[PDB]
Amino acid sequence: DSLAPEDGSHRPAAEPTPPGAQPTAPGSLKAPDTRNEKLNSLEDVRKGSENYALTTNQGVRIADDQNSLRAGSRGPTLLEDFILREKITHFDHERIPERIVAARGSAAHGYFQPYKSLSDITKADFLSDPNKITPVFVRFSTVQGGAGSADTVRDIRGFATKFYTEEGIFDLVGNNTPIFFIQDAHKFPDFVHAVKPEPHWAIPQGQSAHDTFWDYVSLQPETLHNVMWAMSDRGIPRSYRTMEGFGIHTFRLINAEGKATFVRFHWKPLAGKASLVWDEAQKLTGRDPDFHRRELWEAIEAGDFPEYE
Amino acid sequence: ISRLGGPNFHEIPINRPTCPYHNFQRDGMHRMGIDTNPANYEPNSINDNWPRETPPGPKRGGFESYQERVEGNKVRERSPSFG
Amino acid sequence: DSLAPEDGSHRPAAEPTPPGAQPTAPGSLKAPDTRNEKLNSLEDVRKGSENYALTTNQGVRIADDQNSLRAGSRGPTLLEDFILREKITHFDHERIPERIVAARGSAAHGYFQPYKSLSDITKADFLSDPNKITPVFVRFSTVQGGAGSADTVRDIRGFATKFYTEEGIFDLVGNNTPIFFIQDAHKFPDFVHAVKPEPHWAIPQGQSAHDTFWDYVSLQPETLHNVMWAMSDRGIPRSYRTMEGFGIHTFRLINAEGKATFVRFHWKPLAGKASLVWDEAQKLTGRDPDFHRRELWEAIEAGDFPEYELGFQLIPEEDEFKFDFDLLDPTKLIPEELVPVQRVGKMVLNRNPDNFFAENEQAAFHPGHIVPGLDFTNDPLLQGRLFSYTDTQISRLGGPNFHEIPINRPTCPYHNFQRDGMHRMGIDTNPANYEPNSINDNWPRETPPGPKRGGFESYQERVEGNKVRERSPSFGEYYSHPRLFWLSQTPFEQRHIVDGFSFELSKVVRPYIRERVVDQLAHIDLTLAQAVAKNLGIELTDDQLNITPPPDVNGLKKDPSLSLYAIPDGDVKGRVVAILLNDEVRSADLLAILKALKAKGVHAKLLYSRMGEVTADDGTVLPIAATFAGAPSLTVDAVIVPCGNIADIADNGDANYYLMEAYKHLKPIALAGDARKFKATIKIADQGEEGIVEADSADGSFMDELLTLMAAHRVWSRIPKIDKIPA
Amino acid sequence: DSLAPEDGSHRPAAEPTPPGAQPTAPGSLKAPDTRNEKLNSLEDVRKGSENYALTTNQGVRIADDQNSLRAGSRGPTLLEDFILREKITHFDHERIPERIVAARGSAAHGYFQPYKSLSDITKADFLSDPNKITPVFVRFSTVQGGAGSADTVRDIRGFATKFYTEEGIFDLVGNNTPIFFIQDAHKFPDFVHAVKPEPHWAIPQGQSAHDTFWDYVSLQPETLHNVMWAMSDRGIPRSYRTMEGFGIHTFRLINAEGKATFVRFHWKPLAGKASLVWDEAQKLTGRDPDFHRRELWEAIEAGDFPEYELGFQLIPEEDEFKFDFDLLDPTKLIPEELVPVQRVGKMVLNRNPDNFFAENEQAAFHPGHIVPGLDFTNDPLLQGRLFSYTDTQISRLGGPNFHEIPINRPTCPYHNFQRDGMHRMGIDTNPANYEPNSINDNWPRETPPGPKRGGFESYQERVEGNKVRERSPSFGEYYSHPRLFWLSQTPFEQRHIVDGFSFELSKVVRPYIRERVVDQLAHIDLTLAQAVAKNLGIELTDDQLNITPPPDVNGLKKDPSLSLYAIPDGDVKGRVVAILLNDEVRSADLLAILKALKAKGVHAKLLYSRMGEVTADDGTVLPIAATFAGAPSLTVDAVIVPCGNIADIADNGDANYYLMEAYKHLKPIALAGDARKFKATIKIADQGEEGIVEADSADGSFMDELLTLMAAHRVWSRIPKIDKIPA
Ligand code: HEM
Ligand code: HEM
Ligand code: HEM
């Protein structure tokens, strides 16, 4: 009303600013001129708010959003207060189940472009032309902790990329280490239950440092290779910008002549490889549990775009 | 909420209002609307309090219940006039 | 097979053991003879495992649980592998929506018993006899963070108690502070959206230290009272065992006459009140984000049962309007100096759950779950709460039969005409599903209200007024309770409050918000306002310096029951001491140390710079619980360094840091013999300092001094000295 | 209140009673002594009602269940009415998604027993010993219609049996026809979308008589075999008790030695095969849409337990390629003339559920639910099914713990490391939730396959070929089975098939679809095609008239097991006779009539122009079951009209129409003494005609003759006489 400050210092500059210079903001307000085909296609569901009246979800303007309807100002709330029930009902149903694994993750929009046409080895449309730009949506994540867990834990990191190609969506769902812990998918629940919080007390969060994990590892030597990677500084990346990414599995590339080539997918961080040291990582889960999320958001706001080859 | 899977049933095409609708409600299963408002609460200063409440009035005013006088004890009782 | 060690060291002993002595275990395996009616009636759903074959959920025995079915050993997985798909499917669908608020919580089973019959003031069956034992299920929680967030955040704590009475479930759903942030339930989504992670980027987790929180607060002065409690050390409890519990709202007790008495509910920690200090709390969110969940679990496994005394603040109906605040206003507390708490009974938490998810995650508590003998009031916050828990549970727990989830089932009879719904467990045999009916002779039937075993009838409160969306004028006073709270704190508690505000507002990016918040503080107390203003580099104006303080609350200028520490109440039983070992420890010191701690129920954790063992000066082999870095001082209440070969650890950076961190955090430190060489890292005078125990050896006098310091919890006189300690 | 009638007539006797004699009731109240292991295992969730207080779900007794809590008796309802809100909330959430197909179904509990050990061909524990009783839960169903659609529609029927064995649940999910419409599961949605109500307007319900179905059929000739079955009288069974059941797919039996035998599963109705005629069936969907559900339930309450004989078509692994059709093609049947059905066991359905929703609606069957001793085959329709049921059940039944819904639970042990999920009932105490583990000594553990009680291991079938999306060329033959079916039917069955096709094609609005179906029929048989073309005013072209018929099936030009009626198998027990009363019934006829029916377990319903009683000629008071319009001839198998004051009903339109309708639907009619006046109603010659029982009284051979007619079900010779007749 007169709630915003008269000097306009409540609104962040809609331009690239370094970390801590302005309050962060929704991407389309912070950077309205950045676009791609996927961001333009989301325009039909985007909702503004400046200059609009406050309403129910049925479009009824609300007069008093400070109070419930009661019989007397000190009286009982009435069942006929449908404005209050819609508001509390929506509020009551806000949560959805978090992801079974990779619940903790940070994402951002971007784009991909191949350096040259790869039609000699694959007929994939998004790799068929250097001028063909594919919008992407990438989510970086940890594995074990819940959506409310800390970022700089010692854990494997997920690196998922959604490619909005002209011949369909291609998701490249990888990790920051080149192998997995286990060989057959049948043992996935076994391995994930062993790493996750123990079932009696649901401890510990975002840590493989407990009995069941090491029990499993000791009895399943196949896990040692990824364990080595986890115990190294690969388990505590400086940021999502300074970690490698791998599809891990051997997939196949299929060209127009029908020839198959085995392929393993890689993401190279153009900012280079860099990790924290354990002590720093662990203290940081306490001082700023949102440090990787924040780091990623702020780099993009600053114009320091995460780049991967 | 269970028949239509959540609190966003007003976003199912047939149910959408054709007039404007803006508020601070967020999330829920199958959220379609992507809110850009910096604020998800009011009163707020960060979005200058928008969207804002609207006083009741003759046209285009906010909803205000008719102020019926309520007088009685808290009872689980059928009115004798309904008998 | 046989993967377990032949020595049987994989299975914890089914007897009470101290923290860290054994691997923790499911409650029914750790304490099989700890029983209560609720715990025994859960036996029908308890599932064992030893000596059973591994099967599908359909009962089919599995031969190979290591591999998928494939065409050839290097071939493609086949769609007919129904064994893999049931296993992956169940795993794929394990998660359920966390609680909208209070997602993060830790729970345990216990029992409650009254001290005397309360039938003069209430017909509630569970309060009717001192010999009536009510099973309880209690969930302690934070508010803001998700299920995976840390425990020792600065935040309000929830204290929910499910009473399984013989006349129904009664849930007392309270918090650890006596008031709430807002007045009307209509603003709950606004307040919660403000405190929760901001919507663009979902930061920050488990913290109110961000712009939207303080933005809402600056614009809604009714929030200040609860904000003062959150900014005090009340917001960073040492443990769920050492914090108060409150229902917040004024409820009603109804007796068999039908007379109504206004009541506010209290939980008094019989272990007393104790909180961390901010740096310790925040660093503990990183070193052990499961600290309170673990402490609760391990206190119960050790037989250090969390015990609380239920207390009632009772106000006669005719006294409704005798205070200078509205009784129905949830942002207003009833000073204990005005209305004393009457000790009503005691609750003991003596058993952990078997399966966190099944019992803790799925537990459903509701403030509206009341029983004949209790009734609501018009408190506008409580009024809206009555609607909400019912509503959220339908999606959180997938349908309307959440009361059939084992942990939520009443222990008493339940019969009605409600039918179906997702996952219906009950198979009703009633020929009728409606009333009135003649085909089942109208059963189950209504029951008139009465003195005992009667149907529920609301107290007939007179209601007069127009249908209005209006805040009661009586609720429009926002600074006197915050002032009464502030003035009732000790000087160091005040300083921790100032520091809490200063820290939080430092992280608010928009400077105008900090300014608006400092302006609110100026209407509470000038000194408070000035100290926060000075830490923010803000100058109060002329006008802000002259804001007349709010009036006292009914003549009170302070109430010591609002302080954590003003009136001594600490208990050392269940506390923990870190003992910094060396490679030739003076065995006589250890013996004396361990004996004195055991006599007070104080646990010890033996630390060294590597795992394994060390040998004392007489060949006594001492097993090491953790390293210095592995179990930081943050996790203990005091630190003892016995004599021996001090040169072994005297250059250990970690050993020295242990002492400086403990020192910074006001913890009692005891140094024996050449362990006194460690005085130089924490810069203690030759003549000593109160809070540091030191002597030629660790005899009985040394332990008495140490144990006395621990009973006083922290060394508050050390505050001014920690400034010049780089830690 | 105490609303039951003093007299106790609100409650049905807990003893077998004929249909209509008592009010029907929950199975456990109606037949408390009928037990089995599964019925006894459900006792833990059964809930009574008599003599209990009416409460909320939390156990709080309710005083007033007639009113909401309001401010003043004419005031507004208050949000604090938690009793109202829980009651309405449960009500609001009663429904769950109906089954994607087979939403309309009727179920019952029973038991199974093998005639002899089948140990030589299968190690399946439930077939290993004739004294080993296996509890079953069976659901019969239509396919297309919703849960609220009618029973006697023209459609395929589902016949699903849940076997609660000692080594796991085994579900046999079959149909009442031995083949399915399509070959590969990938086209299931296409086929189901086609038969289901059209997407713009959701019409028609419970019917394949619409354009999209016939469009699909005309473009996919593989569907023709099952279309023939559906168009025949097979698609409108008289009752679930009188239809055959089939697994359709070829599965494998695996013995202890590891030998695999191919098997197709069969269910033989011990009450024989019997169907309605289309006009009766369609009309019965209006007069009583619950006719099959009702008949099943009343058969069981009467003690006429539906009994079926399990049968196996067995084929050695060396004979896989010995037939003209692929054994893995589900659109092909295995002629019983080539591979006889060997009798395996008997299934008796002897108790109704207590609660339809809890037991019937939430029951989840799955053809992938097999046990050691059974295995799958590469049938591409079966292969896709294995995926579908698991998936659908996770939303229909709200999560991955649907095996914990009482009806679905195994009666044998089930232990694994699967955890959580919505609605988790089992509280696991296992310290481990993964394997291999040392902390619980690896329990529960895997079990190697063996002759008895061993782990499941798939039969090691050789797999060879490229990863292709391809239909086996051996499946590409579509007309010979349809032709074999056609030729095996009686002449009157063939006319009914012609009539079913004609009727259905008449509802296809786009004439070219009709023509295309006619063209497909002309590839099956010229007589069939021409008769259907003629009914649709279509002329076959000369090319159509010369399409060469498909080859015989392995030398067979007919197989009488494919007919409902070619080989008598009539059983009159549980059938019902309508008795048209007058106001002075000759009591001697009535005694004769009722005793003769009773002797054969044939029920009766005494009908009149009004309810109440009539007094026979000797003062005997006759209670009226229903009016002529109230329980129409569609619901009975035969009609008897006893002597008396016939002039009482001679000019009653309903009484006359009663006989015209029964006469039209080929039902036996018996007229005693002056009831022969009704002969002119149905145009019977003085001489009499086969199918009409007539005599001066109901004495001597009157009832034996009537009962011989009932044993042959319908009077097929009357068909040409019904052509005319305005009814
Ligand atoms: C090569 C090994 C694997 C890698 C690199 C990997 C990677 C990932 C990543 C990065 C995510 C998070 C995606 C997001 O940001 O939303 C994820 C989620 C998930 N993963 Fe995988 N994963 C692997 C193995 C598996 C296996 C073997 C299974 C089960 C058989 C599995 C099941 C899941 C599930 C159920 C989710 C959650 C998806 C959702 O809720 O949308 N993962 N995985
Ligand atoms: C005096 C003020 C309040 C107190 C003391 C309080 C206390 C609590 C506690 C302790 C819990 C967690 C219970 C558990 O451990 O599961 C909780 C959860 C919850 N609160 Fe309240 N709360 C208050 C205000 C409100 C209001 C005003 C609303 C909405 C109108 C609300 C809605 C909820 C909901 C929806 C949950 C989650 C319940 C579930 O998912 O089972 N709370 N609250
Ligand atoms: C031989 C062919 C088939 C037969 C004999 C058959 C039989 C049945 C029966 C009897 C039922 C209902 C069981 C009950 O009463 O609950 C059913 C349901 C169902 N059918 Fe099959 N069906 C066949 C083909 C298929 C195929 C090819 C699919 C998909 C690939 C499929 C998917 C389903 C589904 C999803 C259900 C619903 C089950 C539930 O919600 O529990 N059916 N079918």
Q: Print the SS3 string covering D592-634.
A: HHHHHHHHCCCEEEEEECCCCEEECCCCCEEECCEECCCCCHH
From the CB of D608, is ligand 3 less than 6 Å away? Answer: no
Question: Resolution of this PDB entry, in A?
Answer: 2.2
The residues near D716 (Cβ < 8 Å, ≥ 6 apart) are D490, D492, D565, D666
Distance CA A197, CA A201 (A): 8
Contact between residue D365 and residue D139 where contact means Cβ atoms under 8 Å apart? yes
- Which residue, C573, C603, C619, sits at the end of a domain? C573
Helical (H) or strand (E) element with C627: strand C626-627
D604 & D626 share domain: yes
Minimum Cα–Cα distance from A72: chain B residue: B70
Full DSSP string of C476-532: ---SHHHHHHHHTS-HHHHHHHHHHHHHHHHT-SSHHHHHHHHHHHHTT-HHHHHHH
Measured at the alpha carbon of residue C10, what is the angle toward residues C9 and C12, in degrees to the nearest 5?
A: 85
Contact between residue A29 and residue B38 where contact means Cβ atoms under 8 Å apart? yes
From the CB of D158, is ligand 3 less than 6 Å away? Answer: yes
CB-count exposure of residue C626 (10 Å: 0-12, 13-18, 19+) = middle
Is A58 in the B-facing interface, judged by CB distances under 8 Å? Answer: yes
Compute, in degrees rounded to 10, the torsion defined by CA atoms D189, D194, D195, D201.
110
Q: Is residue A7 part of a domain?
A: no
Å between C85 CA and nearest CA of chain D: 8
Å between B17 CA and nearest CA of chain A: 6
Is A28 in the B-facing interface, judged by CB distances under 8 Å? Answer: yes
Compute, in degrees rounded to 10, the torsion defined by CA atoms A267, A273, A276, A281.
-10
Of D66, D69, D95, the CB nearest to B74: D69
Minimum Cα–Cα distance from A26: chain B residue: B36
CB-count exposure of residue D410 (10 Å: 0-12, 13-18, 19+) = buried
Look at the block and give the residue holding tokens 């209560």: C36
Minimum Cα–Cα distance from C516: chain B residue: B45
Give the CA count within 13 Å in the CB-facing half-sphere of C363. 30
Distance CA D404, CA C44 (A): 13
Ligand 1, atom 17: closest residue by C-alpha? A102
What's the one-letter identity of residue C683?
K
From the CB of A160, is ligand 1 less than 6 Å away? Answer: yes
D374 & D497 share domain: no
From the CB of C30, is ligand 2 less than 6 Å away? Answer: no
Ligand that lies nearest to the alpha carbon of residue D264, given by its number in the listed order = 3
Characterise B48 by phi-psi region: left (phi > 0), alpha (psi -120 to 50), beta (else). Answer: left
Is D418 in the A-facing interface, judged by CB distances under 8 Å? Answer: yes
Minimum Cα–Cα distance from D416: chain A residue: A190
C578 & C693 share domain: yes
Q: How many domains does chain D have?
A: 3
C85 & C210 share domain: yes
From the CB of A78, is ligand 1 less than 6 Å away? Answer: no
Cβ distance of C61 and D437 shorter than 8 Å: no
- Which residue, C529, C545, C573, sits at the end of a domain? C573
Chain C neighbors of B43, CB-CB under 8 A: 190, 216, 219-220
Contact between residue D675 and residue D697 where contact means Cβ atoms under 8 Å apart? no
Is D73 in the A-facing interface, judged by CB distances under 8 Å? Answer: no
D112 & D242 share domain: yes
From the CB of D162, is ligand 3 less than 6 Å away? Answer: no
Ligand 2, atom 12: closest residue by C-alpha? C102
Ligand 3, atom 12: closest residue by C-alpha? D102
Q: Is residue C12 part of a domain?
A: no
Å between A254 CA and nearest CA of chain D: 15
From the CB of C160, is ligand 2 less than 6 Å away? Answer: yes
- For the domain that residue C240 is a member of, what is the CATH number? 2.40.180.10
- Tell me the CA–centroid distance for residue D231 and ligand 2, in Å: 60
Minimum Cα–Cα distance from D441: chain A residue: A215
- For the domain that residue C676 is a member of, what is the CATH number? 3.40.50.880
From the CB of C344, is ligand 2 less than 6 Å away? Answer: no
From the CB of D396, is ligand 3 less than 6 Å away? Answer: yes
Of B28, B33, B45, the CB nearest to A47: B33
Distance CA C199, CA C190 (A): 13
Is C394 in the D-facing interface, judged by CB distances under 8 Å? Answer: yes
Is B20 in the D-facing interface, judged by CB distances under 8 Å? Answer: no
Looking at the DSSP bridge assignments, the partners of residue A237 are: A275
Contact between residue B62 and residue A61 where contact means Cβ atoms under 8 Å apart? yes
Q: Is A245 helix (H, G, I), strand (E, B) or coil?
A: strand
The residues near D523 (Cβ < 8 Å, ≥ 6 apart) are D221, D478, D479, D547, D550
Of B1, B45, B75, the CB nearest to C460: B75
- Tell me the CA–centroid distance for residue D95 and ligand 2, in Å: 28
Q: Are strands D626-627 and D603-608 parallel, antiparallel or unpaired?
A: parallel
Ligand 2, atom 27: closest residue by C-alpha? C185
Chain A neighbors of C206, CB-CB under 8 A: 148, 289
D79 & D157 share domain: yes
Ligand 1, atom 10: closest residue by C-alpha? A158
Residues in chain B: 83
Cβ distance of B41 and C212 shorter than 8 Å: yes
Beta strands (DSSP E) in D339-466 are 341-351, 374-375, 427-428
Minimum Cα–Cα distance from A85: chain B residue: B7
Cβ distance of C461 and B38 shorter than 8 Å: no
From the CB of D721, is ligand 3 less than 6 Å away? Answer: no
Q: Is residue C462 part of a domain?
A: no
Look at the block and give the residue holding tokens 């609460």: B41
C384 & C481 share domain: no
Looking at the DSSP bridge assignments, the partners of residue A109 are: A137
Å between D171 CA and nearest CA of chain B: 30
Å between D139 CA and nearest CA of chain C: 18
Q: Is residue D206 part of a domain?
A: yes
Looking at the DSSP bridge assignments, the partners of residue C106 are: C140
Q: Is residue C517 part of a domain?
A: yes
Contact between residue C727 and residue C660 where contact means Cβ atoms under 8 Å apart? yes
Q: Is residue D494 part of a domain?
A: yes
Beta strands (DSSP E) in C418-487 are 427-428, 462-469
Of C199, C399, C464, the CB nearest to B40: C199
The residues near B54 (Cβ < 8 Å, ≥ 6 apart) are A53, A54, A61, A62, A63, B60, B61, B62
Full DSSP string of D528-591: HHHHHHHHTT----HHHHTPPPPPPBTTBS--GGG-SSSS-----TT-EEEEE--TT--HHHHH
Cβ distance of B2 and D93 shorter than 8 Å: yes
Distance CA C400, CA C390 (A): 9
**Maximum Cα–Cα distance across chain B:** 56
Distance CA D160, CA D175 (A): 8
Query: Per residue in C421-440, is it b (16+ CB within 10 Å) or e — as a string?
Result: bbbbbbbbbbbbbebebebb
Distance CA B33, CA A48 (A): 10
Q: Which of C173, C240, C349 to mutate to test the pocket of ligand 2 (most atoms within 8 A of CB)?
A: C173
C567 & C582 share domain: no
Residue of C73, C72, C138, C91 whose CA lies nearest to C111? C138
D381 & D478 share domain: no
* Both tokens assigned to C94: 């394990």
C566 & C606 share domain: no
Cβ distance of A193 and D437 shorter than 8 Å: no
Å between D76 CA and nearest CA of chain A: 7
Distance CA A273, CA D193 (A): 53
Chain A neighbors of B63, CB-CB under 8 A: 60-63, 83
Å between C262 CA and nearest CA of chain B: 17
D510 & D647 share domain: no
Distance CA D470, CA D326 (A): 15
- Which residue, D508, D541, D573, sits at the end of a domain? D573
- For the domain that residue C482 is a member of, what is the CATH number? 1.20.1370.20
Domain that holds residue D330: 25-410
Helical (H) or strand (E) element with C298: helix C291-302
Beta strands (DSSP E) in C663-702 are 669-672, 692-695
From the CB of C338, is ligand 2 less than 6 Å away? Answer: no
Q: Measuring CA to CA, how many Å separate D576 from each of D299, D305, D671?
A: 11, 15, 16
Q: Is residue D423 part of a domain?
A: no
D194 & D265 share domain: yes
Is A219 in the D-facing interface, judged by CB distances under 8 Å? Answer: yes
DSSP state of C35: -
Contact between residue D206 and residue D284 where contact means Cβ atoms under 8 Å apart? no
Minimum Cα–Cα distance from D395: chain C residue: C422
Q: Is residue C720 part of a domain?
A: yes
From the CB of A92, is ligand 2 less than 6 Å away? Answer: yes
Looking at the DSSP bridge assignments, the partners of residue C614 are: C622
Contact between residue D457 and residue C64 where contact means Cβ atoms under 8 Å apart? yes
- Tell me the CA–centroid distance for residue C176 and ligand 2, in Å: 13
* Both tokens assigned to C23: 């691997």
Chain D neighbors of C423, CB-CB under 8 A: 362, 397-399, 401-402, 405, 422-423
From the CB of C180, is ligand 2 less than 6 Å away? Answer: yes
